[PDB]
Amino acid sequence: SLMEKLKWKIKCIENKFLNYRLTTNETVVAETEYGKVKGVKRLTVYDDSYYSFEGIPYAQPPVGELRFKAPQRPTPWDGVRDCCNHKDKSVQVDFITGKVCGSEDCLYLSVYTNNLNPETKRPVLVYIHGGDFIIGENHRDMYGPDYFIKKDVVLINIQYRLGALGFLSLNSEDLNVPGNAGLKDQVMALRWIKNNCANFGGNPDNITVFGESAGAASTHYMMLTEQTRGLFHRGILMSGNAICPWANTQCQHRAFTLAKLAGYKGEDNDKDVLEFLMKAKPQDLIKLEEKVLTLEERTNMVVFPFGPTVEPYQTADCVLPKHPREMVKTAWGNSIPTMMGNTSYEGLFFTSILKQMPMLVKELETCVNFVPSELADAERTAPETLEMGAKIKKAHVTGETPTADNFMDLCSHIYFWFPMHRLLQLRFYHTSGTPVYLYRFDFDSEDLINPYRIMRSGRGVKGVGHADELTYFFWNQLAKRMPKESREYKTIERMTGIWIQFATTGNPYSNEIEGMENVSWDPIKKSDEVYKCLNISDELKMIDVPEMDKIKQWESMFEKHRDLF
Template identity: 40%
Template sequence: MTNDILIAKTEYGKVRGKQTISALGTEYISFLGIPYAKPPVGSLRFKDTQKPEPWSEIYDAIEEKSHCLGIDSTTKTVKGSEDGLYLNIFTKNLKPNKLYPVIVYIHGGAFLSGSSKLDIYSPDFFLMADVIVVTFNYRVGPLGFLHLNDPELNVPGNTGLKDQLMVLKFVRDNIENFGGDRNNITLVGHSAGGGSVSYHCIVEASKNLFHRAIIMSGCALNMWALTPQRDWAMRLAKILGYEESEEEKNILEFLQNADPVKMTEVQKKLIRPEEFGKITFAFAPHIEPYKTSETFISKRPIELIRTAWSNDIDILIGGTSDEGLMYLENIREMPALLTSLKLTNMVPVEITGLSVDDPIRLEFVEKLRQTYYSSSEPTKDELGFCKLQTDRCFWHGLQRIVQGRQNSGGTGRTFLYRFAVDSPTQNYYKISRFGPDLRGVCHGDEISYLFKNKCCAVPEQNTLEFKSIQRFVSVFTSFASNGNPNSNVIGADMESVEWKPVETREPPFKCLNIEEHLKFEILPETERLAVWDELYKTTKTPLY
């Protein structure tokens, strides 16, 4: 390729990409590290996202830039830089005969870690189809979610979500110059990224910036996806040595000059013992304390869902069969999580007004015991706890999103999936933490069936692993291309199974169950999830 074929225009200036060949032999152009916002440093720390300064020279987008500061999930150390607001674009052709559908992917990481690094998110598998893939970094932890209550300081929070919003606007305004169709954008995210996609689907700020959505293993109704307003900024300042007044102006000045690495390191220490189990993260999406022209979250998600603009667009939504296996890592780090487990504390935080010995609470606890533990002792049963967390932290919220859409009167279709391919070589998240012998499909295991990562070799073509990659990529790229996940744009072996949208207003819901073979069947978790549904109904707490 000549250099001219590698240069694309953006509204801020020209960028030069580099020719790349995928692990499957597909030629494409990588544009790495394009700035989509001003670096949020100095006086812009904690502030809403701002457009980048234009550039006059051609910008070399040929190597990855630093990602945003966060806690590395493997080493548990802080990595990255405050100057991390960059995106990557992967396209086969800047001037195709027909513009490509666009997939914008939001990484996960519990709102305190994660990045778009090619080590984990290389687009090789997606590019079996004629699509463009966009990945990016966004602010996480206190730098991405700290808020202050004083409107004059202009720190309402949720800047991590506003970074994502800026990416969606960049894609809308520039993607045609990379060969992409600005009228055919699918927003995809996993875990905290799935929670983020779920928020973009229900807030007015993101309306019409994408045309379909894929929500993976996380949503706005999961307990961890909304953090309550507390004095997080003050707690953070104090733990870093602040000793002055509680005046927010002084707190902001202190924190804008504090070491961002230390700030990122200490964030988990801010949750008090009495808040354990009720608050998952100090810094995560929250209802902003006052309204501005840039307000992102103004009400509880449950209120936004009912009239969400996205009830009229199609979505795919689902998770893995054993999401909660990830909690084995927490149990091994903090055995007390299990040994001091009280099932009475498993009542969702939305359900208020039940005393410790309320008969409704006690009956619910008994049902939890029967459903997840049978005859075992909860304080000793690791896998029982993981199964409970699968539903409590993931699947129940996902099912409630489906219920909300099915009862909204909207015209959008909802396709439900469940990923259950249990491979000893391809399930990267589980293998990297627990080795290849643990059975079950953990939270995060499906990512390595969409993106190539540095730890998993590309499987041989006749293996279950490669077939599963083709199938998973097929439903995602087919849906992104034309709204029909059955259209099989890459010719995968789909075993003649038709995936229909959810048809009923209430569970049981049918899903595409992706195991060694494909099945279109009632979601296997349905019976367990009914236990949680019943608690909401008994306490007259809205499910949607």
């Protein structure tokens, strides 16, 4: 919307000057294994303060011959690297302006803490942003640490390569482009964190990794791969995981298609395709990415052309040697305390998509296109497939004619709740009682917002959509100071409080969090037929997951195919 584009522009300039007024003249030097870094003390609008180090490199800039390759360790320096300002984001299409932005020089992390020499070593919370593996950043205009730093933790926000630059994959072993470069970036950042967090007051024996959407799938991948075994101690999966249908794809044949879109005149062989892509301008590749999926792939409901993939051959840095469902069978992260959850109306994310293409509601007539692909026949015309679709339809079509709200409710389940259920049940076979706790974010406000609302044209619309909880974890350029007594302020304290408590102890309950005093929050047991979750609304209450009945209806599709569940 052009009206929202100007509004967003205005906010960007106002934010810039606010950030000047929040900068103090106090700078500080910290040590890293690669050299000294200079950070700056900043204020928040609530007059808390924190030390800010941005643009700490954890890898060599992945440029030139290092494009498409696994990250390499950075070059050390003498003297003091200035970390008082942010670096670029990974090359991507800006979600508001629609133009390509960012830089290939993006392999940085940011470290924040209210005290660089604390009296006790602190829980380290590491945030991995979402954005479908194609957008996102660690810039504070979206991921401000201002709320977490009220408490005595170290917060670290990482970047990683996005799009084709992070996720190209080629079958030819001689080329050393097996895939998952962006996940390998995450691995190298977590190793940096283990090796350096003590220099900022952090406890290397108490690291928690958390992320939302693609960042939740990323956190899960970091809990599955052998590359990170033992590197961290708690994980939080917010609205996603690595067995979600949207979280991985086999993209080895798509480099050729991208090259052709970018002007390549050669034959489909990996060596010639790579040499062309190595010479292309990065903006050209990222701009064309939205055209890469073929008619057949769109027909088969492939979501994104480049993303996490099962790597076709083994390398020293290999992150995903098998499908994530197989990786769960041997995963080190099954044995660390885990928290998982979703919002109360995830599918609201599709509001503007449905406004643009209202005919999508016709997919609810039979629902065959929502049947898990491992159960469906190829043509989606088999009677068994239609019956499976009928079970989906019964779960979500509540009136005589299917509605957009029915569609959006279905979306919550296909993309979030059902993969969460499948993961929980699979994981019980491959863990020794390590607890998993469930939350449900159910707090609705429009007095404090984040840019995901603009994306879904969700102004004036009620409901707790995908990513609406991030408003209560991170300051952003649309945020404003809330009164201490306000429901929004209380939700900030509760959300950050629960995450810090879980990061500290592996148990998200604490009687020091307002409204939690009377909460008995047990972890999920294999014997549970109905999941219990902490529902976060204006109150904190343990409830039967309201989505359970629909979850069970989706599971019923596997009654005669239990080996695939």
